[PDB]
Amino acid sequence: MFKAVLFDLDGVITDTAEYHFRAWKALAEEIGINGVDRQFNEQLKGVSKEDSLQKILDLADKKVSAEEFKELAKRKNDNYVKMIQDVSPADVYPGILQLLKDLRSNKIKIALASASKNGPFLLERMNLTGYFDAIADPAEVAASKPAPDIFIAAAHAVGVAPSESIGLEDSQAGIQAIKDSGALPIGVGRPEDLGDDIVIVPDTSHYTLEFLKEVWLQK
Ligand SMILES: O=P(O)(O)OC[C@H]1O[C@@H](O)[C@H](O)[C@@H](O)[C@@H]1O
Ligand code: ALF
Ligand SMILES: [Mg+2]
């Protein structure tokens, strides 16, 4: 039986992938780049703040100064941080709170494997901090998603091997990170976005302990 679950945050625990998208799209447009639509945004999910900005600049073969790059990343973060101030426990996605309770009651470790530097603040807004045994610090890993490092760090932080863990993700980059960590991925979203080669559920209500057990036994 698996011994840990490694959670992505944005688009898994709550609908903040939507807010990252809106904030990045707004930034892109301010700089005259119009290609950040929902389809392109699938390439941005899971990616660090700096890598996100770079992917956007690349879309338009645009170069900015180092000073401008720093200011643009700050402007997007400042906007995003404003957007999330009113997040509350009411915004926890369906199933997630119950899953945390059920994991905790079955002595399964719970770790956050988020790229977001806003992760701790969001878990506090949602009254979830006390369910997490560890939060992997995304500033500490030498490499970000789709590198596996953040998932490996999350597993190690709760004393479990990645191979004894499930990872939950909504992104292409994050699914790849889980695969390369040795943990078992279960995605949430559309197979058209996340692939047909892993288990994908259509919405978070499917993330029950019963189902995670259902998947572990088979794969
Ligand atoms: O800018 P932050 O809060 O550090 O977030 C980093 C990344 O965190 C990931 O969880 C999101 O999927 C990305 O969209 C985001 O860019
Ligand atoms: F959506 Al995340 F780390 F929270 F990629
Ligand atoms: Mg996500």
Short mmCIF file of C-alpha atoms and ligand atoms in Angstrom, two decimals:
data_model
loop_
_atom_site.label_atom_id
_atom_site.label_comp_id
_atom_site.label_asym_id
_atom_site.label_seq_id
_atom_site.Cartn_x
_atom_site.Cartn_y
_atom_site.Cartn_z
CA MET A 1 0.00 0.00 0.00
CA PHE A 2 1.17 3.55 -0.73
CA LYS A 3 2.56 5.48 2.24
CA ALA A 4 2.25 9.10 1.02
CA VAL A 5 0.25 11.33 -1.27
CA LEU A 6 2.12 14.23 -2.89
CA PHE A 7 -0.26 17.07 -3.79
CA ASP A 8 0.10 19.70 -6.41
CA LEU A 9 -1.85 22.82 -5.26
CA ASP A 10 -3.09 24.94 -8.18
CA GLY A 11 -5.90 23.13 -10.06
CA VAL A 12 -5.83 20.17 -7.59
CA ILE A 13 -6.62 21.58 -4.14
CA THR A 14 -8.44 24.70 -5.47
CA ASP A 15 -9.19 26.63 -8.67
CA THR A 16 -6.06 28.84 -8.55
CA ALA A 17 -4.78 27.50 -11.92
CA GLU A 18 -7.56 29.72 -13.34
CA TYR A 19 -6.12 32.74 -11.50
CA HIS A 20 -2.54 32.07 -12.59
CA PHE A 21 -3.84 31.88 -16.18
CA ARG A 22 -5.76 35.13 -15.92
CA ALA A 23 -2.78 36.92 -14.34
CA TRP A 24 -0.29 35.62 -16.96
CA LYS A 25 -2.64 36.47 -19.81
CA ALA A 26 -3.04 40.03 -18.47
CA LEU A 27 0.74 40.43 -18.20
CA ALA A 28 1.35 39.02 -21.69
CA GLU A 29 -1.13 41.42 -23.19
CA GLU A 30 0.37 44.45 -21.40
CA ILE A 31 3.64 43.62 -23.22
CA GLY A 32 1.88 43.11 -26.56
CA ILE A 33 1.92 39.29 -26.61
CA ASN A 34 -1.57 37.95 -27.43
CA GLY A 35 -0.95 34.18 -27.71
CA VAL A 36 -1.69 33.22 -24.08
CA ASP A 37 -5.01 31.46 -24.53
CA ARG A 38 -6.29 28.44 -22.63
CA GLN A 39 -4.66 26.03 -25.07
CA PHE A 40 -1.22 27.67 -24.73
CA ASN A 41 -1.72 27.88 -20.98
CA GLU A 42 -1.51 24.06 -20.80
CA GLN A 43 2.24 24.59 -21.41
CA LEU A 44 2.36 27.06 -18.46
CA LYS A 45 0.59 24.92 -15.84
CA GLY A 46 3.06 23.53 -13.32
CA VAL A 47 5.91 25.77 -14.45
CA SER A 48 7.71 28.21 -12.11
CA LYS A 49 7.02 31.96 -12.19
CA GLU A 50 10.26 32.71 -14.03
CA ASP A 51 9.91 29.82 -16.48
CA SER A 52 6.32 30.89 -17.18
CA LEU A 53 7.40 34.41 -18.07
CA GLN A 54 10.21 33.04 -20.25
CA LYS A 55 7.81 30.73 -22.11
CA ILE A 56 5.53 33.71 -22.77
CA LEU A 57 8.42 35.86 -24.05
CA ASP A 58 9.53 32.95 -26.24
CA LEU A 59 6.09 32.62 -27.79
CA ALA A 60 6.70 36.02 -29.45
CA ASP A 61 10.49 35.62 -29.80
CA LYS A 62 10.60 38.67 -27.48
CA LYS A 63 13.70 39.73 -25.47
CA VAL A 64 13.52 42.12 -22.48
CA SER A 65 16.23 43.45 -20.17
CA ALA A 66 17.07 41.62 -16.96
CA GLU A 67 15.61 44.58 -15.03
CA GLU A 68 12.39 44.42 -17.08
CA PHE A 69 12.14 40.62 -16.60
CA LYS A 70 12.31 41.04 -12.81
CA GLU A 71 9.71 43.84 -12.86
CA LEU A 72 7.29 41.85 -15.06
CA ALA A 73 7.52 38.77 -12.81
CA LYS A 74 6.91 41.01 -9.77
CA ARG A 75 3.94 42.72 -11.46
CA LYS A 76 2.30 39.39 -12.24
CA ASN A 77 2.90 38.12 -8.71
CA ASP A 78 1.56 41.30 -7.12
CA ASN A 79 -1.62 40.98 -9.20
CA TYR A 80 -2.00 37.24 -8.50
CA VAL A 81 -1.47 37.80 -4.76
CA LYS A 82 -4.24 40.42 -4.79
CA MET A 83 -6.54 38.03 -6.66
CA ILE A 84 -6.15 35.25 -4.03
CA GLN A 85 -6.69 37.32 -0.84
CA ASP A 86 -10.38 36.28 -0.59
CA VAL A 87 -9.69 32.55 -1.06
CA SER A 88 -11.32 30.71 1.86
CA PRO A 89 -12.18 27.15 2.97
CA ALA A 90 -15.27 27.45 0.72
CA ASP A 91 -12.87 27.34 -2.27
CA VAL A 92 -11.38 23.91 -1.49
CA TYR A 93 -12.24 21.67 -4.42
CA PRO A 94 -14.81 18.89 -3.93
CA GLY A 95 -13.44 15.76 -2.30
CA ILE A 96 -10.11 17.25 -1.24
CA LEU A 97 -10.88 17.98 2.41
CA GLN A 98 -12.41 14.53 2.89
CA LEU A 99 -9.39 12.90 1.20
CA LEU A 100 -7.03 14.71 3.55
CA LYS A 101 -9.07 13.55 6.56
CA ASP A 102 -9.19 9.96 5.27
CA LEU A 103 -5.45 9.87 4.51
CA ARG A 104 -4.64 11.24 7.96
CA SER A 105 -6.92 8.62 9.62
CA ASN A 106 -5.20 5.80 7.70
CA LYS A 107 -1.71 7.10 8.71
CA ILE A 108 -0.82 8.00 5.12
CA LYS A 109 1.57 10.93 4.90
CA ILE A 110 0.47 14.13 3.15
CA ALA A 111 2.99 16.42 1.45
CA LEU A 112 2.71 19.53 -0.73
CA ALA A 113 4.71 19.27 -3.97
CA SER A 114 3.88 22.73 -5.29
CA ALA A 115 6.04 25.04 -7.38
CA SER A 116 4.12 28.00 -5.96
CA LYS A 117 5.82 30.33 -3.50
CA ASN A 118 2.23 31.35 -2.62
CA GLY A 119 1.50 27.73 -1.51
CA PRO A 120 1.81 28.20 2.28
CA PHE A 121 -0.38 31.31 2.19
CA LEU A 122 -3.08 29.47 0.20
CA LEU A 123 -3.14 26.48 2.55
CA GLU A 124 -3.57 28.92 5.46
CA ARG A 125 -6.42 30.76 3.60
CA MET A 126 -8.15 27.39 3.12
CA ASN A 127 -7.55 26.13 6.69
CA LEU A 128 -5.59 23.15 5.33
CA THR A 129 -2.12 23.66 6.84
CA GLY A 130 -2.73 21.24 9.71
CA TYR A 131 -3.42 18.36 7.33
CA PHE A 132 0.02 18.62 5.69
CA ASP A 133 2.92 16.67 7.19
CA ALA A 134 5.36 18.62 4.97
CA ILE A 135 5.51 21.39 2.40
CA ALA A 136 8.41 21.06 -0.09
CA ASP A 137 10.07 24.46 -0.50
CA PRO A 138 10.13 25.22 -4.25
CA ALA A 139 12.94 27.76 -3.77
CA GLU A 140 15.23 24.98 -2.46
CA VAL A 141 15.07 22.50 -5.36
CA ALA A 142 17.87 22.76 -7.92
CA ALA A 143 15.30 22.16 -10.77
CA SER A 144 11.48 22.86 -11.28
CA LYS A 145 8.64 20.90 -13.11
CA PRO A 146 8.83 18.92 -15.32
CA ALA A 147 12.00 17.99 -13.39
CA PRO A 148 11.00 15.46 -10.66
CA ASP A 149 12.91 17.20 -7.85
CA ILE A 150 9.93 18.84 -6.09
CA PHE A 151 8.06 15.48 -5.87
CA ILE A 152 11.20 13.67 -4.68
CA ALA A 153 11.69 16.39 -2.03
CA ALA A 154 8.03 16.13 -0.91
CA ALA A 155 8.30 12.33 -0.47
CA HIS A 156 11.64 12.56 1.35
CA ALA A 157 10.24 15.31 3.63
CA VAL A 158 7.68 12.81 5.01
CA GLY A 159 10.18 9.92 5.18
CA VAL A 160 8.75 7.94 2.22
CA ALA A 161 10.29 6.84 -1.07
CA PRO A 162 8.72 8.32 -4.25
CA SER A 163 8.05 4.69 -5.35
CA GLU A 164 5.76 4.33 -2.27
CA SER A 165 3.85 7.51 -3.17
CA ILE A 166 0.95 8.77 -5.32
CA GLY A 167 1.20 12.20 -6.93
CA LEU A 168 -1.87 14.27 -7.82
CA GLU A 169 -1.52 16.78 -10.68
CA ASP A 170 -3.52 18.84 -13.19
CA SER A 171 -0.62 19.74 -15.52
CA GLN A 172 1.43 18.18 -18.30
CA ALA A 173 4.68 19.33 -16.70
CA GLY A 174 3.62 17.97 -13.28
CA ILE A 175 2.56 14.62 -14.60
CA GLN A 176 5.98 14.26 -16.23
CA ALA A 177 7.65 15.30 -12.93
CA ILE A 178 5.69 12.61 -11.05
CA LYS A 179 6.57 9.96 -13.63
CA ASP A 180 10.26 10.80 -13.44
CA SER A 181 10.22 10.82 -9.59
CA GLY A 182 9.14 7.17 -9.41
CA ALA A 183 5.76 8.01 -7.83
CA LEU A 184 2.43 6.97 -9.34
CA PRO A 185 0.57 9.86 -11.06
CA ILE A 186 -3.17 10.35 -11.04
CA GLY A 187 -4.16 13.38 -13.09
CA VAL A 188 -7.29 15.53 -12.95
CA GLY A 189 -8.50 17.13 -16.16
CA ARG A 190 -8.88 16.13 -19.80
CA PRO A 191 -6.88 13.23 -21.37
CA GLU A 192 -6.63 15.52 -24.46
CA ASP A 193 -4.44 17.75 -22.25
CA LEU A 194 -2.75 15.31 -19.84
CA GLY A 195 -2.38 12.12 -21.86
CA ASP A 196 -3.97 8.69 -22.27
CA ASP A 197 -1.11 6.74 -20.61
CA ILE A 198 -1.92 7.47 -16.93
CA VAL A 199 -5.10 7.39 -14.88
CA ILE A 200 -6.99 10.68 -15.29
CA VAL A 201 -10.14 11.64 -13.40
CA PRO A 202 -12.57 14.27 -14.71
CA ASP A 203 -12.88 16.19 -11.44
CA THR A 204 -11.46 16.12 -7.91
CA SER A 205 -14.52 14.42 -6.36
CA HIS A 206 -12.99 11.23 -7.88
CA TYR A 207 -9.94 11.59 -5.63
CA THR A 208 -11.24 9.33 -2.83
CA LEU A 209 -9.01 7.15 -0.71
CA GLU A 210 -11.16 4.25 -2.05
CA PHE A 211 -10.18 5.16 -5.64
CA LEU A 212 -6.51 5.80 -4.87
CA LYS A 213 -6.43 2.30 -3.35
CA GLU A 214 -8.37 1.04 -6.55
CA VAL A 215 -5.48 2.49 -8.71
CA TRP A 216 -2.52 1.41 -6.52
CA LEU A 217 -3.65 -2.23 -6.55
CA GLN A 218 -3.82 -2.19 -10.40
CA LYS A 219 -0.61 -0.15 -11.12
O1 LIG B 1 4.28 32.30 -8.92
P1 LIG B 1 4.11 31.17 -7.93
O2 LIG B 1 3.03 31.39 -6.92
O3 LIG B 1 5.44 30.79 -7.33
O4 LIG B 1 3.57 29.88 -8.72
C1 LIG B 1 4.46 29.09 -9.51
C2 LIG B 1 3.64 28.06 -10.31
O5 LIG B 1 2.93 27.25 -9.36
C3 LIG B 1 2.29 26.14 -10.02
O6 LIG B 1 1.62 25.45 -9.00
C4 LIG B 1 1.28 26.68 -11.05
O7 LIG B 1 0.72 25.55 -11.75
C5 LIG B 1 1.93 27.59 -12.05
O8 LIG B 1 0.90 28.13 -12.89
C6 LIG B 1 2.69 28.69 -11.32
O9 LIG B 1 3.39 29.51 -12.26
F1 ALF B 2 -0.23 23.76 -9.80
AL1 ALF B 2 1.31 23.48 -8.85
F2 ALF B 2 2.85 23.25 -8.07
F3 ALF B 2 0.53 23.94 -7.34
F4 ALF B 2 2.11 23.11 -10.37
MG MG B 3 -1.43 22.54 -10.83
#
